[PDB]
Design a binder for this molecule. Structure first.
Ligand SMILES: CN1C(=O)C[C@H](C(C)(C)C)N1O
Ligand SMILES: [Cl-]
Ligand SMILES: [Cl-]
Ligand SMILES: [Cl-]
Ligand SMILES: [Cl-]
Ligand SMILES: [Cl-]
Ligand SMILES: [Mg+2]
Length: 345
């Protein structure tokens, strides 16, 4: 066990191993507080996150276990990895606090956008390489957007901030970036969704890198649907049958029919290969969208594609997701995963 020291950082007691020095507050959501620090053991600048109320309810206790399982599995150049996880507790009996350690990242894709064709190829290639890995483990990200994609000092892109099923009705309301990158089937609850929702989000991000403008900046759910159908066309009888929601189906049929627009006349002056890839990502019927593995082999990425250096994940057991347990059982499973952690090479 390392030695721990205590300090107060903005109304909060932080108890951390001596290796972590120069702690300074960076931010706080409602799921925890984050400090920047220097890790003297590795020489990395790191983000230390202290979870808030990790075991306060069955829903929260399971969310904590879900986030630690996910971060411990992800071992890929284009995905955030777990550098460390610790608790000052010496036993399960006194376990209350969980701290997660990851690489401090540089500029996100909002900061980058706010670019040549060569830069767009390079950045979308890395997102797709990381998504081929995530999807191979049957994980859906569910929240891809520019603020969840950042590059380090060497311009290596990493996917962060996986959807832990955490978004509130309020957070998705109105003129908000939290909704602009979502597939219509998840935005309006049309049907059981799958990993295809992440490729819709990649199409929206790629469009915004090419034009410097949000593709579907809707003022609310219905305004954003009208922007979407004006570009890709209203649904045919084949997709309407797959909308299992009867009243969602009824509303779509109230809209005047519109054809798919010419993407060369929308993305004026873009590489014709970029236009072709956008037409394959931005398809209303999710069964028909291009997959990450198929997109890596598209001619737009000829300069970067190497099928011997696009790895897949180890198998990932998510049987816990359908298990019903008490708060103290989720808390014991979480404690076991904290004490068994082995740091990267
Ligand atoms: C370090 N780095 C960035 O932050 C973006 C930049 C571009 C590929 C956009 C040029 N890359 O080199
Ligand atoms: Cl230490
Ligand atoms: Cl990492
Ligand atoms: Cl504790
Ligand atoms: Cl964003
Ligand atoms: Cl597993
Ligand atoms: Mg985020």
């Amino acid at each position: 066990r390392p030695t721990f020291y205590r300090q107060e950082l903005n109304k909060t007691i932080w108890e951390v191993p001596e290796r972590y020095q120069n702690l300074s507050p960076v931010g706080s959501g409602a799921y925890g507080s984050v400090c920047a620090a220097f890790d003297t053991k590795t020489g990395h600048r790191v983000a230390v996150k202290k979870l808030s109320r990790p075991f306060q309810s069955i829903i929260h206790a399971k969310r904590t276990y879900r986030e630690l399982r996910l971060l411990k599995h992800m071992k890929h150049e284009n995905v955030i990895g777990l550098l460390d996880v610790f608790t000052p507790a010496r036993s399960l009996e006194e376990f209350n606090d969980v701290y997660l350690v990851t690489h401090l990242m540089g500029a996100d894709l909002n900061n980058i956008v706010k670019l040549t064709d060569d830069h767009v190829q390079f950045l979308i290639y890395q997102i797709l390489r990381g998504l081929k890995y995530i999807h191979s483990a049957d994980i859906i990200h569910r929240d891809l957007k520019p603020s969840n994609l950042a590059v380090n000092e060497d311009c290596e892109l990493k996917i962060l901030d996986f959807g832990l099923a955490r978004h509130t009705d309020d957070e998705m309301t109105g003129y908000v970036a939290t909704r602009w990158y979502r597939a219509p089937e998840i935005m309006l609850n049309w049907m059981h969704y799958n990993q295809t929702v992440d490729i819709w989000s990649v199409g929206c991000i790629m469009a915004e890198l090419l034009t410097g403008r949000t593709l579907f900046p809707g003022t609310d759910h219905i305004d954003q649907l009208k922007l979407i159908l004006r570009l890709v066309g209203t649904p045919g009888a084949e997709l309407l049958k797959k909308i299992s929601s009867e009243s969602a189906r009824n509303y779509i049929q109230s809209l005047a029919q519109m054809p798919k627009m010419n993407f060369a006349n929308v993305f004026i002056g873009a590489n014709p290969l970029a236009v072709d890839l956008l037409e394959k990502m931005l398809v209303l019927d999710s069964d028909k969208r291009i997959t990450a593995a198929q997109a890596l082999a598209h001619a737009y990425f000829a300069q970067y594609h190497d099928p011997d250096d696009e790895p897949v994940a180890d198998p990932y057991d998510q049987s816990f997701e359908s298990r019903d347990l008490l708060i103290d059982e989720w808390k014991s499973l979480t404690y076991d995963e904290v004490i068994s952690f082995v740091p990267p090479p």
